[PDB]
C-alpha cells in the first residue's frame, strides 16, 4: 500500500514524528531523510515491532528516500531561537522548502506534500509556485499542516471550561473536542481563528472566551517562552502532525475521518468550493486559507465551507483581521519566488 | 487514575518517553523532572489534547515532581559514548540512580519504580540496596525495564524468517509476536536470552538461529554503530518503555496485560516463586533475573516460571552463561552501595 517519506526526520519535530509514524498501521515503508543522522534514526525505529519497514537515508540520498513515495511530510526547517527574526526564519526556510519541494517534483511529483515548516502562511505558497514552475502542481496534493492549532484549541477549550465552571469541564473529554471547535485561517497569532461550533460553550466560557481565543492564537509564543528562549514546540507538533498524516493515510483505505472538520492550509482556486470559500471569507482573490477539507487517496478533493456560514460578529472580526494579514503573508511568499 | 513521574524526562529517551506517556488514557497527572529543560517540555506536552495534566519541574523541584506519584520511570542516565570505559559509564549512572531512588524513598516511598537507566543488571541492585538501607524497599515495586529486548526479538524473528521463508515471514504480525518469543535474563549481550517458544520456528531458522539470537543480544551495539558513535537507542526505547509502563498502569484497572509473558528484571528473594526461579536457573543465590511477571495494581505479585521448565540444550547453555555474568553484574551494583 503506502510509502511515507519524512524530509527533516532528525530534528526536534522530525524524530518524534518519525516515531509516531512507525506506529501507524497504514504505513508499509517509512523513509527518513535529513542532512544528518537519518540512517541511525531509521535503524533505531526499525527495531520497533510494527509492520512497517523503516530506512533512513543519508544527505546525498534524497532520491532513494522519495522514489515511489505517496506522502511526504516536511518537518525540515529552522525553528525559532533568540538570535533570529521572523524575516531570518522566512528566508532560510524558504530555501529549504524550495529545494525539498523541487526534489519532490523530480522524484515523486504525485505525492501528497504535508508542509510543517513555518511560516506555513508563506512557505505553502513557495511550495505551490515551485511546483507550478515545474509543471508538477496538483492542488489537492499540497497541504499546510495547521493541525497543531486544532490540537491546542481542543485542549484549551477544556482547560478554560475547568477554570470557569468545574461542572461543565468534567463532561469534556479533550480527545473528542473537535466536535465542538474548529480552527481556520493561517498559522500565526494574527491568522489563527478559533471557531467554537458549540454556541452554548461560547456563552458558558463567559469572560474566559477572549482569553481562550488569545491562548490558541499565541500558543507558539507560549512554548518558546516555556523553553526559555532555546526551543519551540516539538513533541506536540509531532503529535498533531502525525494525527493529520493519519487522516491523510486513512483516506487511501476508504475510511471516515476521525476528526470532524479537519483543517489544512490549501490553495483555494484549484479546489472545489474554493471560490465559495473566497467569498465567504470576504476576499475574492485570496489564494490560500486553512479550512476543513475532504480527503480521497490522500488528496484534497473538496473544501467544506460550513464553518464559514454561521460566524458570530466576533468571529467575523477575527476572519477580517486574518484575511488582511494572510494577504500580506501570501504575497511575501509568492514574490520571493516570482 | 494514577500519577506518573519521569526522572530524566529531557533526554534522548526521556522526551519521546514523556510524549508517549502523555497519550496514555491510564494517567491522571504526568510530572516531568530533569537536571534541565523539563518545564518547557512539560508545557509543550500540556498542549496535546489527551486528558492527563502534564507539568515539568526544575532540578530543585523533585519534591513536587514525586508528591503522590504512584509510578516512577527513570530514563535518567549517561548513555554509551565513543570515549567511555565500562567502569566510568557505570560510575556515572550508579550515582544518578542512587540519588533519584533516594528521592523516591523520601518523597514517594510506595511508588512502582521503573528503571530504564543502563546497566540495568547493576543499577536495579543499586536501587534495591539503596531502598533497603532507607527501610523503604518493597520487592513488588522495583523493576528493571528490559522490554526493549522483547521488542527487538519479535522484530528480528520476523526479519530473519522473511529472508529464510517469505511464505511464513509474511504470515507473521511483528506486533503480536510476544506469543512466539519471550526474552529472559539480563539486559546485555552476554545476559539476554531469547526463548523462541513455538519450536518449529527454530528449525525454519536453521543456521539463522545463532545469527538471530546474536542480533537480539547485540541490538544495542547495532544502534550505537548505526548512530556512528553519537547516541544509542532512544525512540525504540521510549516505545518499549512506554508499552511496559502501560502494562503496569493497566494492572491498576483490573485489565489483563496485552503482552503475554511480559518480563522485567526483578528481585527474586522478595517475590512469590522467586526461589523456584533460582533453582530452575541453576543458582540458588542469584538475586536478580528478568522473567515473566504478574502485576496486581502496579506491583509484581508473582513470577511465572513456565518458560524456564522447558529448555533446549542451547537455551540452558544460554541460561548458564547469563547467570555467570549476572552474578558479577549484581555484585558490581551491590558493592557500590554496601561499601
Ligand atoms: N506547523 C506548525 O504548527 C509548527 C509547529 C512547530 C514547529 N514548526 C516548524 O517546524 C520546523 C522544524 O522545527 P524543529 O523544532 O523540528 O527544528 P530543528 O532545527 O530541530 O529540526 C529541523 C531539521 O531539519 C533538518 N533540515 C534542515 N535543512 C534540511 C534539508 N534541506 N533537507 C532535509 N532536512 C533539513 C535539520 O537538519 C534538522 O534535522 C521549523 O520550521 C518550525 O518553525 C511548525
Ligand atoms: N533499558 C534499556 O534497554 C535502555 C535502552 C536505551 C537506553 N538506555 C539507557 O537510558 C539512559 C538514557 O539515555 P539517553 O540516550 O536518554 O541519554 P541522554 O544523555 O540523551 O539523556 C540523559 C538525561 O538524563 C538526565 N539526568 C542525568 N542525571 C540526572 C538526575 N540526577 N536527575 C534528573 N535527570 C538526570 C540528563 O539531564 C538528560 O536529560 C542511559 O543510561 C541509556 O543507556 C536503556
Ligand atoms: O511558534 C513557532 O515558531 C512554532 C509553531 O508554529 C508553533 O508552535 O505553533
Ligand atoms: O546499548 C545501549 O547502550 C543502550 C541500551 O540499553 C540498548 O539499546 O539496548
Coordinates of C-alpha atoms in Angstrom, one line a residue, chain A residues 157-326:
Chain A
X157 CA -11.3 24.7 25.5
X158 CA -11.4 22.0 28.1
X159 CA -8.7 23.8 30.3
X160 CA -10.8 27.1 30.2
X161 CA -14.1 25.3 31.0
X162 CA -12.3 23.6 34.0
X163 CA -11.3 27.1 35.3
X164 CA -14.7 28.8 34.8
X165 CA -17.1 26.0 35.7
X166 CA -15.8 22.7 37.1
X167 CA -19.4 21.4 36.4
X168 CA -19.2 21.6 32.5
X169 CA -15.5 20.9 32.2
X170 CA -16.0 17.4 33.9
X171 CA -18.1 16.2 30.9
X172 CA -15.5 17.4 28.4
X173 CA -13.0 14.9 27.0
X174 CA -10.0 16.5 25.3
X175 CA -9.7 13.7 22.7
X176 CA -13.2 14.4 21.2
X177 CA -13.5 18.2 21.4
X178 CA -13.0 18.6 17.6
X179 CA -16.8 18.0 17.6
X180 CA -17.1 21.3 19.4
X181 CA -14.3 23.5 17.9
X182 CA -12.7 24.1 14.6
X183 CA -9.7 26.2 13.7
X184 CA -9.4 28.1 10.4
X185 CA -7.3 30.8 8.8
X186 CA -3.5 30.7 8.9
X187 CA -0.8 29.6 11.3
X188 CA 0.4 32.7 13.2
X189 CA -1.1 34.7 16.1
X190 CA -2.8 37.3 13.7
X191 CA -4.2 34.5 11.5
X192 CA -5.5 31.7 13.7
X193 CA -9.3 31.9 14.0
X194 CA -10.7 29.5 16.6
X195 CA -14.4 28.8 15.9
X196 CA -16.3 27.3 18.7
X197 CA -19.1 25.5 16.9
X198 CA -21.0 24.8 20.1
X199 CA -22.5 28.2 20.8
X200 CA -23.6 27.1 24.4
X201 CA -20.0 26.8 25.2
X202 CA -19.1 30.2 23.9
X203 CA -21.6 31.6 26.5
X204 CA -20.5 29.3 29.3
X205 CA -16.9 30.5 28.9
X206 CA -18.2 34.0 29.6
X207 CA -15.3 36.4 30.1
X208 CA -12.8 33.4 29.6
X209 CA -13.8 33.3 25.9
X210 CA -11.4 36.1 24.9
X211 CA -8.6 34.5 26.9
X212 CA -9.3 31.2 25.2
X213 CA -9.0 32.9 21.8
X214 CA -5.8 34.6 22.6
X215 CA -4.3 31.4 24.1
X216 CA -5.0 29.4 21.0
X217 CA -3.6 32.2 18.8
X218 CA -0.3 32.7 20.7
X219 CA 0.3 29.0 21.7
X220 CA 3.6 29.2 19.7
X221 CA 4.9 32.1 21.8
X222 CA 3.8 30.3 25.0
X223 CA 6.1 27.3 24.3
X224 CA 9.0 29.4 23.1
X225 CA 8.8 31.2 26.5
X226 CA 8.4 28.0 28.5
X227 CA 11.5 26.5 26.8
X228 CA 13.4 29.7 28.0
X229 CA 14.4 31.0 24.6
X230 CA 16.0 28.0 23.1
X231 CA 13.3 25.9 21.5
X232 CA 9.8 25.9 20.1
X233 CA 7.0 23.3 20.2
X234 CA 8.4 19.9 19.0
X235 CA 6.8 17.0 20.7
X236 CA 3.2 18.3 20.4
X237 CA 3.8 19.2 16.8
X238 CA 5.0 15.7 16.2
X239 CA 1.7 14.5 17.7
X240 CA -0.5 16.9 15.8
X241 CA 1.3 16.3 12.6
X242 CA 1.1 12.5 12.9
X243 CA -2.6 12.9 13.7
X244 CA -3.1 14.8 10.4
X245 CA -0.9 12.3 8.5
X246 CA -3.0 9.5 9.9
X247 CA -6.2 11.2 8.4
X248 CA -4.4 11.6 5.0
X249 CA -3.4 7.8 5.3
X250 CA -6.9 6.7 6.3
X251 CA -8.1 8.2 3.1
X252 CA -6.2 5.7 1.0
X253 CA -8.2 2.8 2.7
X254 CA -11.6 4.4 2.2
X255 CA -12.3 5.2 5.9
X256 CA -14.2 8.0 7.7
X257 CA -12.0 10.8 9.1
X258 CA -11.9 10.7 13.0
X259 CA -11.6 14.5 13.3
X260 CA -14.8 16.2 12.2
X261 CA -13.8 19.4 10.2
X262 CA -10.1 18.6 9.8
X263 CA -8.4 21.7 8.5
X264 CA -5.3 22.4 6.4
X265 CA -3.9 25.4 4.6
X266 CA -4.7 24.9 0.9
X267 CA -4.8 26.6 -2.5
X268 CA -8.4 27.8 -2.8
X269 CA -8.5 28.5 -6.6
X270 CA -7.7 24.9 -7.5
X271 CA -10.1 23.1 -5.3
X272 CA -13.8 22.5 -5.3
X273 CA -15.7 25.2 -3.3
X274 CA -12.6 27.3 -3.2
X275 CA -14.4 30.2 -4.9
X276 CA -17.2 30.0 -2.4
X277 CA -14.6 29.9 0.5
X278 CA -13.0 33.1 -1.0
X279 CA -16.4 34.9 -1.0
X280 CA -17.4 33.7 2.5
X281 CA -14.1 34.9 4.0
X282 CA -14.7 38.3 2.4
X283 CA -12.0 38.3 -0.3
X284 CA -12.5 37.1 -3.8
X285 CA -8.9 36.7 -4.9
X286 CA -7.2 35.3 -1.7
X287 CA -5.3 32.2 -2.8
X288 CA -4.8 30.2 0.5
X289 CA -6.7 29.6 3.7
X290 CA -6.8 26.9 6.3
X291 CA -10.2 25.3 6.1
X292 CA -11.9 21.9 6.7
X293 CA -11.1 19.5 3.8
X294 CA -12.4 16.3 2.4
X295 CA -9.8 13.7 1.5
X296 CA -9.7 10.8 -1.0
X297 CA -6.5 8.8 -1.7
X298 CA -4.6 11.3 0.3
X299 CA -5.7 14.2 -1.9
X300 CA -8.0 17.1 -1.1
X301 CA -11.0 16.8 -3.4
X302 CA -13.2 19.4 -1.7
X303 CA -13.3 22.2 0.9
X304 CA -16.2 22.1 3.3
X305 CA -17.2 25.7 4.0
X306 CA -20.0 25.0 6.6
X307 CA -18.0 26.6 9.4
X308 CA -17.9 29.9 7.4
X309 CA -21.7 30.1 7.3
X310 CA -22.5 30.6 11.0
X311 CA -19.9 33.0 12.1
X312 CA -20.6 35.3 15.1
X313 CA -19.9 39.0 14.8
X314 CA -16.8 38.4 16.9
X315 CA -15.6 35.6 14.6
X316 CA -16.3 37.8 11.5
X317 CA -13.8 40.3 13.0
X318 CA -11.2 37.6 13.6
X319 CA -11.7 36.5 9.9
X320 CA -11.2 40.1 8.7
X321 CA -8.1 40.5 10.8
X322 CA -6.8 37.1 9.5
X323 CA -7.5 37.9 5.8
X324 CA -5.5 41.1 5.8
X325 CA -2.5 39.5 7.4
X326 CA -2.8 36.4 5.2

